Amino acid sequence: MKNKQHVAIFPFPFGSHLPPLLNLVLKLAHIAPNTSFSFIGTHSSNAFLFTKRHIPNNIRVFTISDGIPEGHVPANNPIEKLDLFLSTGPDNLRKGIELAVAETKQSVTCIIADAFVTSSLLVAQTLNVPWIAFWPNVSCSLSLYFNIDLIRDKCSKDAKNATLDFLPGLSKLRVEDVPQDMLDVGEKETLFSRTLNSLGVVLPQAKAVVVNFFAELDPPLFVKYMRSKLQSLLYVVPLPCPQLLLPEIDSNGCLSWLDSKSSRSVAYVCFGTVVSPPPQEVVAVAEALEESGFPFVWALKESLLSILPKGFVERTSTRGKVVSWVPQSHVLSHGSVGVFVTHCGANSVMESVSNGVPMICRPFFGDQGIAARVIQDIWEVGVIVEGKVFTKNGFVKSLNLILVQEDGKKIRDNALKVKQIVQDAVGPHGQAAEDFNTLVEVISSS
Numbered sequence: 001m002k003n004k005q006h007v008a009i010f011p012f013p014f015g016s017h018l019p020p021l022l023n024l025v026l027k028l029a030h031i032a033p034n035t036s037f038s039f040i041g042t043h044s045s046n047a048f049l050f051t052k053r054h055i056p057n058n059i060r061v062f063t064i065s066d067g068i069p070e071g072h073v074p075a076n077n078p079i080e081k082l083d084l085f086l087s088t089g090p091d092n093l094r095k096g097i098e099l100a101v102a103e104t105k106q107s108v109t110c111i112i113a114d115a116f117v118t119s120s121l122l123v124a125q126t127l128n129v130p131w132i133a134f135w136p137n138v139s140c141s142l143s144l145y146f147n148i149d150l151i152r153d154k155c156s157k158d159a160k161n162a163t164l165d166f167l168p169g170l171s172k173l174r175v176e177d178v179p180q181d182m183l184d185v186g187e188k189e190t191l192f193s194r195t196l197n198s199l200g201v202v203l204p205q206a207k208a209v210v211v212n213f214f215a216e217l218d219p220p221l222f223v224k225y226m227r228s229k230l231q232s233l234l235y236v237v238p239l240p241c242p243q244l245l246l247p248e249i250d251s252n253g254c255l256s257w258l259d260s261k262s263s264r265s266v267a268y269v270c271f272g273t274v275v276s277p278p279p280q281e282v283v284a285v286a287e288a289l290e291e292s293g294f295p296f297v298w299a300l301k302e303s304l305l306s307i308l309p310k311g312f313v314e315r316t317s318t319r320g321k322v323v324s325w326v327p328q329s330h331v332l333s334h335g336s337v338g339v340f341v342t343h344c345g346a347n348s349v350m351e352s353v354s355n356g357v358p359m360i361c362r363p364f365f366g367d368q369g370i371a372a373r374v375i376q377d378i379w380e381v382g383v384i385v386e387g388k389v390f391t392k393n394g395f396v397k398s399l400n401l402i403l404v405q406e407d408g409k410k411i412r413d414n415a416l417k418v419k420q421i422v423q424d425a426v427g428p429h430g431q432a433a434e435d436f437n438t439l440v441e442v443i444s445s446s
């Protein structure tokens with residue numbers, strides 16, 4: 001009998017949403033070489049993922065519109081391109097289905113999609129195939145979308161430090177941690193925010209929800225609560241499969257520089273690929289790093305070099321490296337790194353906890369605030385920077401606490417314990433290995 005299984009995949013075609021989904025598809029394609037996987041992105045997302053990359057013969061890449069008409073120039077803000085893509089609706093996605101069907105000569109039997117591409121659920125329903133939602137954001141934020149009215153009410157009435165006890169397992173979360181996106185009502189709403197707010201209604205329609213994280217790290221009560229809301233909740237280990245990686249390079253010599261440093265002594269600083277930090281906070285980070293005396297690696301976009309203090313890079317040249325880009329996952333895996341100063345993007349957080357590196361957190365947008373709260377108050381593997389924004393004195397204090405002070409010992413110890421938990425979770429007999437098998441069988445059975 002001819003195998004005719006054919007999975008169509010729709011990433012949210014933007015930045016750090018891309019590698020985690022390719023990673024899952026590579027693992028699925030490897031274990032089911034007789035199954036077709038059709039990865040449907042935009043011209044820009046495909047260039048981002050596939051330019052210098054060999055892919056398995058059962059993965060094929062297709063291109064759909066990004067929703068930016070020729071001639072249009074989006075404003076310099078992270079949401080516009082997201083809105084324009086989402087505005088293309090299910091018909092754009094169905095152009096991708098068409099291309100995949102024409103190439104494979106196989107009808108689609110199953111769709112895997114980043115949960116933000118809610119239009120692909122309509123596509124799956126039209127085709128009468130299961131829809132599998134992929135969740136690469138902070139795992140704990142799933143609960144928010146089932147409690148929007150309660151959350152809005154509490155954020156409008158109660159104190160900023162009031163806890164969200166009505167969320168099972170997440171009583172440590174506070175009003176101040178809530179994504180502003182989900183509170184905005186009226187002109188401030190965007191197609192993006194409206195799409196995320198629909199997740200409470202969208203996600204229970206998924207055959208399964210696949211979380212790009214470790215179940216062992218989420219509060220068990222939160223996991224139980226989410227199971228009660230979904231048809232199936234699966235946790236597939238987010239660590240990279242062999243074929244996701246390129247040969248590691250180091251054009252800045254970060255790793256060799258780190259080799260010259262002592263165990264857990266270096267502060268690694270990075271705000272990710274999206275955050276445009278306030279210039280005043282960039283200056284504060286520099287002043288604090290210099291004042292602290294600690295060795296540091298700061299991955300900083302080169303457009304921001306002009307606003308660093310005059311002579312800062314030069315004065316700190318013998319103890320610090322300020323560079324445009326680093327192999328971050330390999331930097332975080334280096335024994336010399338003692339703290340990660342982060343915006344708390346989900347992928348950065350994953351890389352940090354899996355490598356036993358404690359964090360100093362300054363969440364900027366989206367669900368970073370949720371991640372920061374989990375890091376400080378649940379896992380207890382880091383702190384939210386003193387004052388909630390970078391200041392020279394506050395950041396210096398946070399650096400001292402984690403890197404050197406006896407008062408930071410508990411956090412340092414916890415980071416190591418969490419690393420061991422992750423190491424024990426990725427084993428062949430782990431529940432995550434079972435969840436992966438479960439997902440493979442959903443695809444097989446489709």
Ligand SMILES: O=c1ccn([C@@H]2O[C@H](COP(=O)(O)OP(=O)(O)O)[C@@H](O)[C@H]2O)c(=O)[nH]1
Pocket residue numbers: 015016017270271272273274275299324325326327328329344345346347348349351
């Ligand atoms: O100099 C850098 C800066 C970032 N990253 C990677 O970019 C991703 C950042 O995604 P995250 O979800 O942390 O935040 P975002 O950039 O999407 O805000 C992570 O995989 C980082 O390891 C990197 O490799 N080198």
